Amino acid sequence: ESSIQVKNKGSIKLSNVKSVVNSSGKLVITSRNTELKLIDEFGRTKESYKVPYGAVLAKGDGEQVAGGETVANWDPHTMPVITEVSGFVRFTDMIDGQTITRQSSLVVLDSAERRPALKIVDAQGNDVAQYFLPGKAIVQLEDGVQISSGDTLARIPQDITGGLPRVADLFEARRPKEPAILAEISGIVSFGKETKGKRRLVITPVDGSDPYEEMIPKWRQLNVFEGERVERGDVISDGPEAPHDILRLRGVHAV
C-alpha cells in the first residue's frame, strides 16, 4: 500500500474511486474497490496497483508523470478511514471499568465488556455521520478538538501452494480454509447480535428492500466501513474466495 513503482509514463485512472475531503491538498478514498491504470499513448495499460481506502492521492488525475515516482503513499500497517463529518469528536456512553481499559490515548469502548456512534459534532454544540467504535479502538483526541475532514483516529489499525496441489484443488473445486463472507442483501454496514446462537457478529444487514437473515461467524475480523461500504453485489471482505460463491453471485463469466 506504500511501495508503488511505475514502469513508464501513465495516467491515474482511478476507475470509479469515491473522492472524499482530505486533511492535506488531496482527495480521500472511502470505497473498498479501487484500481489504477497507466495510460502512456493509447488505451493500453501498464499495471493495476490496487490500493486500499487509506490511500492518499499524491498527484492529479490524468496528469502525465515522467516515471520512477510514487503516486499514492499510505500506511502499510494502519488502515485509515475517511471521516464522515468535519468537527469535534462526540464521545459518550463511556463508563470507567467497562469502556476504559488502557491509558490522553484510551480505548473508546469494549463490546464484550459492555459502540458509541451517536453523531459527530461539526460545531461547538451542533452535530449531524456516525463515529463507529470498533473493538480495541484507540482515542487520543477528546471532545472539542474540532479536527478537519479526513482525519482518522485509530480506525481499527492492523491453501494455495503453487504446484500440482493447487491445480488439483482448482479442478475439483476444493473449498478454501477461510471462505469470504458475502451478502448481496442490503449491503450497508451496521452492528448488533454480539452474543447469539451463532458466533460473534451474527448478522449485519440493513433495511434496503426485503432484507434476509445471513449468519456471520466473524473469526478473524470484519470489513465494515463508515459510509457506502458496498452495494448490490459482493466484494472480497475477509479471506480468499470460494468458486461456489462466485457461481451463485457473480454469474458464470466471472467464474
Swiss-Prot record:
Residues modified as N6-acetyllysine: K37
Source organism, top-level taxon: Bacteria
Practical uses of the protein: Co-administration of salinamide and rifampicin or salinamide and myxopyronin suppresses the emergence of resistance to both antibiotics.
Post-translational modification comment from the UniProt entry: Acetylated on several lysine residues in the presence of glucose.
Extent of the signal sequence: none
Function: DNA-dependent RNA polymerase (RNAP) catalyzes the transcription of DNA into RNA using the four ribonucleoside triphosphates as substrates. Resistance to the antibiotics salinamide A, salinamide B, rifampicin, streptolydigin, CBR703, myxopyronin, and lipiarmycin can result from mutations in this protein.
Family designation: Belongs to the RNA polymerase beta' chain family.
Subunit and interaction comment: The RNAP catalytic core consists of 2 alpha, 1 beta, 1 beta' and 1 omega subunit. When a sigma factor is associated with the core the holoenzyme is formed, which can initiate transcription. The rRNA transcription and antitermination complex (rrnTAC) consists of RNAP, NusA, NusB, NusE (rpsJ), NusG, SubB, ribosomal protein S4, DNA and precursor rRNA; S4 is more flexible than other subunits.
Name assigned to this protein: DNA-directed RNA polymerase subunit beta'
Residues of the full protein shown: 947 to 1229 of 1407
